[PDB]
Each structure stands twice: as C-alpha cells, then as structure tokens.
Enzyme design. Structure first.
Site, PDB file in Angstrom:
ATOM      1  N   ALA A  98       0.817  -1.206   0.000  1.00  0.00           N
ATOM      2  CA  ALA A  98       0.000   0.000   0.000  1.00  0.00           C
ATOM      3  C   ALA A  98       0.857   1.266   0.000  1.00  0.00           C
ATOM      4  CB  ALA A  98      -0.938  -0.006   1.187  1.00  0.00           C
ATOM      5  N   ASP A 120       1.558  -2.940  11.499  1.00  0.00           N
ATOM      6  CA  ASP A 120       2.806  -3.247  12.190  1.00  0.00           C
ATOM      7  C   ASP A 120       3.597  -1.999  12.571  1.00  0.00           C
ATOM      8  OD1 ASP A 120       4.756  -5.539  13.044  1.00  0.00           O
ATOM      9  OD2 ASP A 120       3.230  -6.538  11.798  1.00  0.00           O
ATOM     10  N   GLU A 191      -5.747 -10.441  14.990  1.00  0.00           N
ATOM     11  CA  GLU A 191      -4.914  -9.609  15.846  1.00  0.00           C
ATOM     12  C   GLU A 191      -5.713  -8.861  16.896  1.00  0.00           C
ATOM     13  OE1 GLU A 191      -1.633  -7.640  14.513  1.00  0.00           O
ATOM     14  OE2 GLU A 191      -0.904  -9.384  13.371  1.00  0.00           O
TER      15      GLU A 191
HETATM   16  C1  LIG Z   1       0.025  -6.508  12.291  1.00  0.00           C
HETATM   17  S1  LIG Z   1      -0.792  -7.271  10.867  1.00  0.00           S
HETATM   18  C2  LIG Z   1      -2.554  -6.906  11.115  1.00  0.00           C
HETATM   19  C3  LIG Z   1      -3.416  -7.815  10.243  1.00  0.00           C
HETATM   20  C4  LIG Z   1      -4.907  -7.498  10.231  1.00  0.00           C
HETATM   21  N1  LIG Z   1      -5.136  -6.167   9.665  1.00  0.00           N
HETATM   22  C5  LIG Z   1      -5.485  -7.636  11.640  1.00  0.00           C
HETATM   23  O1  LIG Z   1      -5.940  -6.658  12.240  1.00  0.00           O
HETATM   24  O2  LIG Z   1      -5.510  -8.732  12.214  1.00  0.00           O
HETATM   25  C6  LIG Z   1      -0.423  -6.110   9.526  1.00  0.00           C
HETATM   26  C7  LIG Z   1      -0.574  -6.807   8.179  1.00  0.00           C
HETATM   27  O3  LIG Z   1      -0.332  -5.903   7.124  1.00  0.00           O
HETATM   28  C8  LIG Z   1       0.573  -6.450   6.191  1.00  0.00           C
HETATM   29  N2  LIG Z   1       1.424  -5.359   5.686  1.00  0.00           N
HETATM   30  C9  LIG Z   1       2.528  -4.809   6.287  1.00  0.00           C
HETATM   31  N3  LIG Z   1       3.001  -3.825   5.482  1.00  0.00           N
HETATM   32  C10 LIG Z   1       2.213  -3.742   4.386  1.00  0.00           C
HETATM   33  C11 LIG Z   1       2.237  -2.925   3.264  1.00  0.00           C
HETATM   34  N4  LIG Z   1       3.189  -2.004   3.142  1.00  0.00           N
HETATM   35  N5  LIG Z   1       1.272  -3.070   2.281  1.00  0.00           N
HETATM   36  C12 LIG Z   1       0.286  -4.028   2.414  1.00  0.00           C
HETATM   37  N6  LIG Z   1       0.276  -4.839   3.533  1.00  0.00           N
HETATM   38  C13 LIG Z   1       1.216  -4.699   4.502  1.00  0.00           C
HETATM   39  C14 LIG Z   1       1.350  -7.541   6.915  1.00  0.00           C
HETATM   40  O4  LIG Z   1       1.588  -8.643   6.065  1.00  0.00           O
HETATM   41  C15 LIG Z   1       0.419  -7.947   8.036  1.00  0.00           C
HETATM   42  O5  LIG Z   1      -0.282  -9.107   7.654  1.00  0.00           O
END
Ligand SMILES: C[S@@+](CC[C@H](N)C(=O)[O-])C[C@H]1O[C@@H](n2cnc3c(N)ncnc32)[C@H](O)[C@@H]1O
Length: 216
Positions: A98, A120, A191
């Site tokens: 994104a 994250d 999460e």
């Molecule tokens: C901490 S997890 C939270 C997952 C979900 N949104 C939840 O609340 O359970 C953040 C997710 O975003 C994805 N992610 C991290 N950076 C990203 C990026 N730059 N573009 C798209 N997805 C990303 C990661 O693979 C991870 O699965």
C-alpha cells in the site's frame, strides 16, 4: 500553498486492472468499483465481517505477504461456495504494498473507506505526508480513514501525522461510538481477538477526508 499537492495540473490515472477476475459476479463490463479498502488485511477477518454489513459495496483487502494472500483467496472461495447467490461475492484480496503509490490502483476519489487495522509498528519509500496525500487522492471527499492499534506509540504517531495533513480531520468520540464500522473493526481480526486475550488496550482514531479547496 499548503494544498498545492492536491490542486494538480496533471492528476494521475490508475494502471490497467482486471477487476472482473476478483469480482466476476459484477461482470455485466464492470457493474461496481471497489469502494472499501482494508490496508494490510492479514487473514481477511475484517473483510469477512464487513461483507454482509455493506452488501452493496465492493471491499478489497491488500496484503503484502503472498503466503497470506494465497491463503485468504482460498478462504473467500470457500465462503462463496458454502453460501445465497451474493454471499461474499463482494470481497476479495490483492497482493500489494500500500506504500507503493495507491493511485496506481484506484481512481481519484474512488474510495469511501480506508481501514488500517492493527498495522505493524522504509524499504520501498520513506513514510511521509506524501503517503497520506496519496491516501487522500484515492479517498472521496467525505470519506473516512479508520485506525486501530494496541500500540500506544503507533497510535500517537498515526494521529500526529493525520492531524498535521491539511486534508484529514479527526472525528469525535461520539462519532466513533455511534459508528458501525468502528464496532466491527474492534474485534473482527485475529490480531484484534488476540489483544483482548492479552488484556491489551485498543486505541481507535478516525479521520474524514476534507474537501480540497477549489482552484478552478
Ligand atoms: C500486524 S498485521 C494486522 C493484520 C490485520 N489487519 C489484523 O488486524 O488482524 C499487519 C498486516 O499488514 C501487512 N502489511 C505490512 N506492510 C504492508 C504494506 N506495506 N502493504 C500491504 N500490507 C502490509 C502484513 O503482512 C500484516 O499481515
């Protein structure tokens, strides 16, 4: 001055995208556009819950890890199969970063909602107001950014930059408390179900995409 980045002689257009493969049920031509985006959707929980809540909106999760997106694809195919004729036909997932220029993906003002659920807490590019400007570009005037995290420092960092940007305005606690998306967002995701188990705190913040002042 402050809005120069948003009053543009040469606004960009998205790259070619076969959305019909993700939402074949709206193949007449394409009948709808993606209006709800779950940025960094992980395993898709939020999309699953939003799906019935917003049966008229196409919803897209974007996930940077291919393992996770390959999994989520099999998941929504299962949900469609085990389901009326419109069930989960309005959700799908896309492997993408994104932070790599969202205007490649969506037309100007295409989106009404953008979710950042437990992000994250800069390989391709540094995070800046410019990123938020790319978000504003794809987000309709009156659209909303939804934000939740258990990480106070991430929460405060997001809030800081969203309020600094001239096209985002924070919505009140009252607004949050009466909003169905905030409710869903709080515990729709793995999460989010994790954090309540850990007795953790859930920091919410939502912003409206302000109208850009007219240039003519
Ligand atoms: C901490 S997890 C939270 C997952 C979900 N949104 C939840 O609340 O359970 C953040 C997710 O975003 C994805 N992610 C991290 N950076 C990203 C990026 N730059 N573009 C798209 N997805 C990303 C990661 O693979 C991870 O699965």
């Amino acid at each position: 001055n402050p809005f120069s980045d948003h009053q543009l002689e040469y606004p960009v257009s998205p790259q070619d995208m076969d959305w019909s493969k993700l939402y074949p049920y709206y193949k007449n031509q394409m009948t709808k556009k993606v209006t709800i985006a779950d940025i960094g959707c992980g395993f898709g929980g939020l999309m699953i819950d939003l799906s019935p809540a917003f049966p008229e909106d196409l919803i897209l999760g974007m996930e940077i890890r291919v393992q996770v997106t390959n999994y989520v694809e099999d998941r929504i195919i299962a949900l469609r199969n085990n389901t009326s004729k419109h069930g989960f036909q309005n959700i799908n997932v896309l492997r993408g970063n994104a932070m790599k220029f969202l205007p490649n993906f969506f037309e100007k003002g295409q989106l009404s909602k953008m979710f950042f659920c437990f992000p994250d807490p800069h390989k391709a590019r540094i995070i800046t107001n410019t990123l938020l400007s790319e978000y504003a570009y794809v987000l309709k005037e009156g659209g909303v950014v939804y934000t939740i995290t258990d990480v106070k420092d991430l929460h405060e960092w997001m809030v800081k930059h969203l309020e600094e940007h001239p096209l985002f305005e924070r919505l009140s606690k009252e607004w949050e408390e009466n909003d169905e998306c905030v409710k869903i967002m709080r515990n729709a995701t793995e999460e989010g179900k994790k954090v309540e188990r850990k007795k953790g705190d859930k920091f919410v913040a939502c912003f409206t995409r302000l109208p850009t002042p007219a240039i003519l």
